[PDB]
Point group: C3
Chain length 54, copies 3
């Protein structure tokens, strides 16, 4: 009607989009933890084999 309309819509875009950026980042970071845990545990196992051998 339309200034107050554009304005309201823009504000909706703003909150929504911002909550999406944060969500993507949490979700990807989680994944990254899940994958990198497997590498850390493998590494933990290897130094422990080494120490035992020594």
């Amino acid at each position: 009607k339309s200034s107050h309309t554009l304005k309201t819509a823009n504000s909706y875009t703003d909150v929504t989009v911002s909550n999406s950026t944060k969500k993507a980042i949490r979700e990807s970071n989680q994944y990254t933890d899940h994958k990198f845990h497997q590498l850390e545990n493998r590494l933990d196992k290897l130094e422990k084999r080494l120490l035992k051998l020594l």
Copy 2:
């Protein structure tokens, strides 16, 4: 009717972006996980050689 049309464009386009964001990021993670695993596979071979070397020493 317009406001409803903007907002529902926002919801749809936002939902697709979050998905593309995660999908790309994860793909990059996977590439980095593989590069590390290449390293770990090597290290484990050297431990396996060192191990056989150590039981040669005994004597």
Copy 3:
């Protein structure tokens, strides 16, 4: 119209967002990767050292 200014606004802000999320998440991965690269380098080094000493000890006897 008003559906055109609000929709182009939404596309531009969605665009910047997508790029920001991927960038930030990849920084996260990069940092964790470095940390682990660090832990690997050290272990590699000790192993190389221990192979050198053991091999030399073997040839000597």
